[PDB]
Structure 1
Amino acid sequence: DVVCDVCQSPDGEDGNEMVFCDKCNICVHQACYGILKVPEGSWLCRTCALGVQPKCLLCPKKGGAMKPTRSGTKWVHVSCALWIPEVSIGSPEKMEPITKVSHIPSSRWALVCSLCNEKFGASIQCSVKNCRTAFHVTCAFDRGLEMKTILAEEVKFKSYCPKHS
């Protein structure tokens, strides 16, 4: 039916409802996109409100829930910012801005996404400890890899290559 673009979940919660953008028809949880209060009527995402189609600094995928850095001139996928370790979210409840992008190591910038083979952006790797297979977060989602947020002794983000999914 309908799924949240960030976490790929179809179910809402009390105080964490599914909200739809009036223009691009995208769907996001309150907690996933930083919506503090359910709107009284229609609602717009950030890029539709600004009227721009920015490219993600970290992956080659176009469209989807994106948030801006402190500058407001650069944009990053919420999923990419969540799943890439070195990236941090300025506000954990407003879900913005996307910061510490400069902290991504050169070794991560050097990884080639095994799914699209586009030497652009930043890729994460398989959660299995010896699996060096790398891929974009958005590519991992679109291709259909196992992408879970599990609760350990603490939320841990697990992304598994096709072989280990």
Structure 2
Amino acid sequence: ARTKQTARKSTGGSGSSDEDVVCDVCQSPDGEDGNEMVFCDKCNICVHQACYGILKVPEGSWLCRTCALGVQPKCLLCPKKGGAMKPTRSGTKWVHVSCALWIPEVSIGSPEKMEPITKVSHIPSSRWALVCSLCNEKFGASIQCSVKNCRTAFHVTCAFDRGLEMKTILAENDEVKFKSYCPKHSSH
């Protein structure tokens, strides 16, 4: 499959194939050791292996789940269509991987496969009650700024699309903490 590669040829020039391409899930621009950035050959999103559950990069074509099934579903947790999505346990509904990761109560189940997406019902009612301060659509679940006593709310996908600071911290047991910061509190 087509992957984003960073290296320097003997011909000179840039050291990256797709310089403006980021992972659709975590928006990082770089592949990592054992963690290639793989393109979907239909919708052209690029995703880390570890962000989407790609155990091994296929030598042939690769399609994301929604393209492989020929569907364009909405996310249960936000109003955005398109992007890296995974199905619920029974296959009837779909959730953005980023929404699932950044909303704490959502479960991924298998770290290797990054699916099924479960425990959506464990999201407390307060996240559904909030109105995203970025798009103002009374739909889906919103998270809040990690700053002390800042309760500005936003969808995960809206946070990514509007340039908010979305931070991941890696700990020694290989768990990952997911933090988010409103515009006023973002570092950049």
TM range (shorter): over 0.9
Residues 48-83 of structure 1, C-alpha deviations (whole Å, 9 max, x = no match): 000010000000011000000111010000000000
Separation in 2 of the partners of 1:15 and 1:151?
16
Summarize deviations over 1:104-146 as a string: whole Å, max 9, x none.
Answer: 1111110100000000000000000200100000000000000
Give the secondary structure class of the aligned counterpart of 1:31. helix
Q: What's the TM-score, normalizing by structure 1?
A: 0.96
* Residue in 1 that maps onto 2:154: 135
Per-residue Cα deviation, 1:11-32 (whole angstroms, up to 9, x for no partner): 1122110110011011000000
Residue correspondence of structure 1 range 46-61 to structure 2 within 5 A: 46-61=65-80
Aligned sequence identity (%): 99
CA distance in structure 1 between the partners assigned to 2:148 and 2:120 by the alignment: 24
Give 1:155 shift: 2.8
- Partner residue of 1:163? 184
Please say which structure displays the higher CA radius of gyration. 2
- Larger strand proportion of the pair: 1
1:113 aligned onto 2:132: yes
SS at match of 1:150: strand
Q: Secondary structure at the match of 1:108?
A: helix
Normalised to the residue count of structure 2, the TM-score between the two structures is 0.85
1:151 CA drift (Å): 3.5
Instruction: Quote the Cα distance in structure 2 between the aligned partners of 1:124 and 1:45.
Output: 26
Stretches of structure 1 that go unaligned for 5 or more consecutive residues are none
- Separation in structure 2 between the aligned mates of residue 68 and residue 155 of structure 1, nearest angstrom: 22
Structure 2 Cα separation of the partners of residues 105 and 148 of structure 1: 22
Corresponding residue to 1:93 among 88, 91, 112: 112
